Paper text:
Integrase (IN) is the essential retroviral enzyme responsible for insertion of the reverse transcribed viral genome into a host cell chromosome. INLAIs bind to HIV-1 IN and compete with LEDGF/p75, the host factor that directs lentiviral integration toward actively expressed genes. The primary INLAI-binding site on HIV-1 IN is a pocket at the core catalytic domain (CCD) dimerization interface. Acting as molecular glues, INLAIs induce a pathological interface involving HIV-1 IN CCD dimer and the CTD leading to hyper-multimerization and aggregation of the viral protein.
To visualize the details of the interactions between the BDM-2 series of compounds and HIV-1 IN, we took advantage of a two-domain construct spanning the CTD and the CCD of HIV-1 IN, recently developed for X-ray cocrystallography with INLAIs. We crystallized this protein construct in the presence of the small molecules and refined the resulting cocrystal structures containing BDM-2, MUT871, MUT872, MUT884, and MUT916 to 1.8, 1.7, 2.1, 2.4, and 1.8 Å resolution, respectively. Similar to what was observed with BI-D and STP0404 (45), the asymmetric units of the two-domain cocrystal structures each contained a single CCD dimer with a pair of associated CTDs. Every CCD-CTD interface buried a molecule of INLAIs, well-defined in an electron density map. As recently shown for BI-D, STP0404, and BI-224436 (42, 45), BDM-2 and the analogs make hydrophobic contacts with the side chains of the CTD residues Trp235, Tyr226, Lys266, and Ile268. The carboxylate groups of the INLAIs form salt bridges with the Lys266 side chain. However, the interactions of the BDM-2 INLAIs with Tyr226 are mediated by cyclopropyl sidechains, and therefore lack the aromatic stacking component that was prominent in the case of BI-D, which features a bicyclic aromatic scaffold. Moreover, the compact nature of the benzene scaffold and small size of the cyclopropyl side chain allow the side chain of Trp235 to approach closer to the CCD than in complexes stabilized by STP0404 and BI-D, resulting in a shift of Trp235 Cα atom by 1.4 and 1.9 Å, respectively, concluding in a pronounced pivoting of the entire CTD domain.
Residue numbers in the entry:
A (entry chain C): 222 to 229, 232 to 273
B (entry chain D): 57 to 140, 149 to 187, 193 to 211
C (entry chain B): 56 to 140, 149 to 188, 193 to 208
D (entry chain A): 221 to 229, 232 to 273
The structure:
């Protein structure tokens, strides 16, 4: 699955649930709150190593 | 277990040495990192995970080891983190070898890697031979 | 071939220097982004590599960093024989290909480099390169 | 146990040179066909530790 880390405050928050990866913004959910974050403030990470 | 590592930082000459030990063998890798931060720790872990089958890393509660960038690296690479004496014993041993060889190199980091080599190659098996044997056995027997 | 034989070469992306080492018999690789393509950076890379693996021979082209005095010193101290003059060049291309596949997942080029190293070393044909180097070296003990 | 000497004159390092003699303040070395006296601080005497 995916986890999204994101910024607002320079500390990276998350993991949040990924909902949509847009060109300029990312839609996520973090603790039941829906958030829209700019692409540059989001880090979308897979569990590649399982 | 073949997949268990301990990581910790130690200091010499105002510089930060990040040390990884393969607990079952005593094998070590180390880097002088420019700052004792989560970002530098996370990059080190990604390199380590590409070389060996890193399944669990044990650390103390230093803020670099509990940082979000390290959690991200561990999630990507499939590493489980556990928190809270092998590496602390290993810190002292490495500093001892470093002090024995320090005047042979200009840079502290050169002495650090000389000491790592010396530690890993010393024999009737060395730590470098033991980690390769432990991991290959796990593979060769499913 | 010999379990002790490695090839090293530099490649370049985004204006940065990537130093790559390949264990010829397994395909296993290690890489680092170095700040300058110098003998001193190459020598330091070799000291680290020699501490991890039984490095007996390193094969390179005649790039001035590989023929430098500092690298000679490192190889002398570590017990490494140097030979000069297509495995690593094939590996450079494959590494650059994986980097491109994952590049937008990391801010820093060096982060994507290490992700690509991990991907290459862990992929099974049916052993992975990371399994073959450990299998080859343990058997040769 | 074998030794080679690397040294400066020019900030580029030279060598390997054969170690002829080590004194308290200088090393005497032979780089190809020239014998040189080099201050200790400008020389690195390196053993083939890996062996
Ligand atoms: C800074 C420097 C300059 C010159 C040398 C060699 C004389 C040729 C070495 C060197 C090169 C290799 C070497 C040792 C020393 C000592 C024994 C182990 O192998 C180093 C070295 O710095 C690096 C970054 C490694 C180049 C250092 O810190 O003195
Ligand atoms: C610069 C930066 C910031 C934040 C992160 C994480 C969101 C918390 C990562 C990161 C951390 C771990 C990680 C990946 C990315 C991508 C997948 C592999 O694991 C990186 C990262 O820089 C390093 C130097 C590695 C910290 C980068 O260049 O984006
Ligand atoms: Cl003298
Ligand atoms: Mg600590
Ligand atoms: Mg080249």
């Amino acid at each position: 699955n995916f986890r999204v880390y994101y910024r607002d405050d320079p500390v990276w928050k998350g993991p949040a649930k990924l909902l949509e990866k847009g060109e300029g913004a990312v839609v996520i959910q973090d603790n039941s709150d829906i958030k829209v974050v700019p692409r540059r403030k989001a880090k979308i990470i897979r569990d590649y190593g399982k």
